[PDB]
Amino acid sequence: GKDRTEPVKGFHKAMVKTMSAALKIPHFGYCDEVDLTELVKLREELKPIAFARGIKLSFMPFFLKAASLGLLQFPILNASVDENCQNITYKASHNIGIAMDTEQGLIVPNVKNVQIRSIFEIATELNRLQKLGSAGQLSTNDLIGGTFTLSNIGSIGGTYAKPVILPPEVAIGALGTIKALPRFNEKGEVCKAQIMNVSWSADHRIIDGATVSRFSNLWKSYLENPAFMLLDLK
Amino acid sequence: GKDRTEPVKGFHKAMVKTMSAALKIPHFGYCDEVDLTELVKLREELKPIAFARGIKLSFMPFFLKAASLGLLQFPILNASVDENCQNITYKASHNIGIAMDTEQGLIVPNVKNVQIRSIFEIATELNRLQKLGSAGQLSTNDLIGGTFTLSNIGSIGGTYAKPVILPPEVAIGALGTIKALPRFNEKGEVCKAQIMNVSWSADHRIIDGATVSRFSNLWKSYLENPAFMLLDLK
Amino acid sequence: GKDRTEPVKGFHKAMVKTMSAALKIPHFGYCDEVDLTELVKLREELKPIAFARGIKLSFMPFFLKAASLGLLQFPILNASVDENCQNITYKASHNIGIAMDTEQGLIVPNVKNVQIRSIFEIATELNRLQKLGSAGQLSTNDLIGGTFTLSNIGSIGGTYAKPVILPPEVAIGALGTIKALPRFNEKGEVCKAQIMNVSWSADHRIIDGATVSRFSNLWKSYLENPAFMLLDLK
Amino acid sequence: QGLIVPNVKNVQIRSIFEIATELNRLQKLGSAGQLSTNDLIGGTFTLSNIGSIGGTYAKPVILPPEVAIGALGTIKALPRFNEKGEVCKAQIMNVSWSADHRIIDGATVSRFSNLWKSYLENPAFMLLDLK
Ligand SMILES: [Cl-]
Ligand SMILES: [Cl-]
Ligand SMILES: [Cl-]
Ligand SMILES: [Cl-]
Predict the structure, then answer these.
(1) DSSP secondary structure string for all residues of D6-17
(2) Where does CoA bind (chain D)?
(3) B69 alpha carbon to ligand 2 midpoint, in Å?
(4) How would you label B146-166 residue by residue, b for 16+ Cβ within 10 Å and e otherwise?
(5) Residue C94 is among the residues annotated as catalytic for this protein
(6) What angle do CA A11, A13, A15 make, to 5 degrees?
(7) CATH number, domain at A230?
(8) Catalytic residue list contains D100
(9) How many separate domains does chain A show?
(10) Touch C-A: 3+ C-beta pairs under 8 A
């Protein structure tokens, strides 16, 4: 009825500080659309195997593994920079953060070493981080060491977005809602295509547009043609 | 054929300062598409009732009422924040600004108290502000006290945007051109759908992704299905 | 397979400076889609004539000429601003930059005086700049005096982007991938339309929303209706 | 020179692509009669791709002291019912296993076979557990 004023208190303090720190990073946005039809079908095919094994199989495990595969080719996107971008540290480990909101705000735990983990393992670690995350039970280790972040806004809504890079990282993707839209196939006939938008933000002080674009294409070729991931997995 | 220097003077100075103060806000962007097929139809129907009552009715009053509805559920989006973001003021009134550009620069009049006004009353207030706005006669009271802003860029053109938040507000939305596109219906058949793009920017220091996304979904559902708006109005 | 730290050195130092400088600019984003079906056709009929004169004709010359035609009508976009944005210098020459990444990232040579050059002249000049750029042999003068930049991200991939303005310029545009989509014609029939996205960033300290937008529609109208460009060419 | 059987080492930590690379290598060497001791030794299990020449089914001979071997026949397009019940082009291959029945029982080879098969009938199934 009247205006209420309140302290930003406690845990809400971290977001203020994280997001303010991101003012120092000149964001270059790059977006695309990804045709996820073959992926949607694929997820359906593996749904029963993963249920049998006790896991719920979402799309994220696929996005994560493709991102990682992509980071092998473009390792500069899995790097950090110092106070004034004097120096860059390339990080061997793909510790990929998953953005979450809680009643206490923004939390980003990461799956460690995605580069040596299978899609099934990634699914398992996601379930774990999510359960812990919703019980307020994430460890310090779950939160530190993140090298790269994906944010599935698409689980609530949206198409395109402009996500905020988390210092000290240099890049973040936001995934929008998967939507059936009319699109042409190779014969030029109108099909049902499952279309997802992706939006990357990159620190343009050390990531040029070709890097992020080509990374995006590789990420996207992997998801549009899942079998392509098969080639180099062991 | 020749270069020319000029001072930024007078009313142009104000835009320099607002936009410069916005640099302190870490902007998070979130976008969506909205099916306005029922609303376009609904609007054609109310046109003559408005014309009879002396009012040009556009889409904005609907966008305004629906924003105020969502803000009731997500009042943090109608809030303000202080010098270095240590206190939130949650603001009772929904003073929603309509961003206009004048032969004089950026001007943001608002509709006071949208939460206690009807679409028709909002339309009346919009007509008043346009009369005065395009004549250069907006008054101090019409300009001040804004809590939240929408910007109808699509009255000129466009799809998505990155609007710039007006301090000390925490969010702003931009609406694109309503435009007919091929889209699937429930039966999986190809229809004409009146599609509009929405682009929100929010102060990620105190507004997380889920809040802007859920707000946006709510706003969207009020517009995709105007019937829902019926339920709670008095 | 461990971390490697490294100095940002040599040429990459320039990208850090430029992009850091761009933080002082409150970027406003405006985006749209452009129907290039006629243009694509048009280019197909011209390739032969230009191949016959020893010039590869891409889309870029068209985009450049149209931008140029638009800047004649909206000259504030081809302007520069000083230290805390107190004076605007309107630039007579349209020296449009073409953002390129080399094996050393960001290089932005420009075509001098687009306002007085033919599309064929612009193609020619773009060809000169490619030859040089990929040989790492662009000269000083090729790189200075830029007044406005285009960045054709879509020659790799992409739909929308949030490009970074290059001080002391006040605007840049990014062009996405040209992609066949299902679109209604005037009869209300589903057609194959050759669609491209454009994303504009502008310094909202001195360029307002209506200015970017109307400039964009003009540019867009020149491309959707290439005949329109004839009217005032000499 | 007759029968020669090199093996790809430690397949379980290699990708399809590395395996392909090793095959081309062993194929090259084999042709030039240049295979090393180390290439020929230590095999634990054998495949014979008879269908690079011909055949459907086969009875391949186990290589002591291994306990199993698979022969692969020619991939042929054959008419087969789909999920509906309509005739389709199906790309059909035969596999014949021989197993030392002193220690390998019928369910084992068969259950092994099914697993292999479904990996190949639904290649996406392999995506799932590779690293
Ligand atoms: Cl920026
Ligand atoms: Cl679309
Ligand atoms: Cl930011
Ligand atoms: Cl900004």
Answers:
(1) ---S-GGGS-HH
(2) 27, 48-49, 52, 73, 75
(3) 28
(4) bbbbbbbbbbbbbbbbbbbbb
(5) no
(6) 95
(7) 3.30.559.10
(8) no
(9) 1
(10) yes
